[PDB]
UniProtKB/Swiss-Prot annotation:
CDD domains: cupin_CDO. Keywords: Dioxygenase, Iron, Metal-binding, Oxidoreductase, Thioether bond. Fe cation binds at residues 82, 84, 136. Its EC number is 1.13.11.20. Monomer. Signal peptide: none annotated. This is Cysteine dioxygenase type 1. One of its GO terms (molecular function) is nickel cation binding. Binds 1 Fe cation per subunit. Ni(2+) and Zn(2+) can be used to a lesser extent. Pathway: Organosulfur biosynthesis; taurine biosynthesis; hypotaurine from L-cysteine: step 1/2. It comes from Rattus norvegicus (Rat). Pfam families: CDO_I. Induction: By increase of sulfur amino acid intake. Catalyzes the oxidation of cysteine to cysteine sulfinic acid with addition of molecular dioxygen.
Amino acid sequence: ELLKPRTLADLIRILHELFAGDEVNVEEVQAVLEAYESNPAEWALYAKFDQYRYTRNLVDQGNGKFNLMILCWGEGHGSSIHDHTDSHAFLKLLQGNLKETLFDWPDKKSNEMIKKSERTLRENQCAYINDSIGLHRVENVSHTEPAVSLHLYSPPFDTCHAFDQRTGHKNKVTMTFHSKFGIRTP
Ligand SMILES: [Cl-]
Ligand SMILES: [Fe+3]
């Protein structure tokens, strides 16, 4: 029985219930993420920005079933075109707007990766992707407003692939944390 999360802490408790088993009800998870109304005081501890690129700030390790983290995107900061390592990936905007561009998996032939679609994700909205849907790039295209998003990955993963938009060629990247549980982790 899904109830509205009253706070970030309440959301986390509810997520631990939704991930208590071995499968994932994507629609329920997305609905509860969407229902949490972003309250900046509740997540200020995790919102640690870097001047030069977006940061990943671990919030909860989900008893091993998921990683929940907050990503902080300066003006103009964005990702590579990337996959999600056979995991579910949920993205909820806490502050600002992000542009999500979708791409198909490349063929073996070296070719330009052409976007399949794009959308602007707005405050409090929750998007979802997995490798069966495709690849994406996520970008804060604003010149004036930093963005903050809440990401849930299940199972957790610490590597993924970045794709060269010119060729479709992929390279494995290891994902790093800027902080964990509010503590900067050099
Ligand atoms: Cl993502
Ligand atoms: Fe992603």
